[PDB]
Copies of this chain bind each other. A is one copy, B any other.
Amino acid sequence: SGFRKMAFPSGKVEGCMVQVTCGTTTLNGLWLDDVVYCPRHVICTSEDMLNPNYEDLLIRKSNHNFLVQAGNVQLRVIGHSMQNCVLKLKVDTANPKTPKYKFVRIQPGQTFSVLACYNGSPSGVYQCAMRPNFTIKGSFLNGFCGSVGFNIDYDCVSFCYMHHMELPTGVHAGTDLEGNFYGPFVDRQTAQAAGTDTTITVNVLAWLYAAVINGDRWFLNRFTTTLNDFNLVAMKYNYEPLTQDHVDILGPLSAQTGIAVLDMCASLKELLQNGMNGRTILGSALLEDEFTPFDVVRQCSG
Chain A contact residues, CB within 8 Å of chain B = 1-12, 14-15, 115-116, 118, 122-126, 137-144, 166, 170-172, 214-215, 275, 278, 280, 283-286, 299, 301-302
Contacts and interface: CB of A to CB of B under 8 A. Distances in A.
Nearest to A5: B126
Contacts of A143: 302
A278 B280 contact: no
Given A170-B2, A302-B142, A7 B285 contact: no
A74 to B, nearest CB: 19
Given A142-B302, A143-B302, A286-B285, A124 B7 contact: yes
A116 to B, nearest CB: 7
Contacts of A123: 6, 9, 302
Contacts of A125: 6-10, 125
Chain B CB count within 10 A is highest, among A115, A139, A144, A299, for A139
Contacts of A299: 124, 139, 141
Contacts of A15: 11
Contacts of A8: 124-125
B285 A284 contact: yes
A280 B285 CA distance: 10
Nearest to A171: B2
Chain B CB count within 10 A is highest, among A172, A280, A286, for A286
Given A9-B115, A284-B286, 9 more contacts: A1-B141, A1-B166, A2-B140, A2-B170, A2-B172, A7-B7, A11-B11, A280-B286, A284-B285
A98 to B, nearest CB: 15
A284 B60 CA distance: 47
B122 A11 contact: yes
A142 B2 CA distance: 12
Contact of A170 (B170, B214, B275): B214
Contact of A9 (B1, B4, B14, B171): B14
Contacts of A2: 137-140, 166, 170-172
Chain B CB count within 10 A is highest, among A126, A166, A171, A284, for A126
A167 to B, nearest CB: 10
A14 B7 CA distance: 13
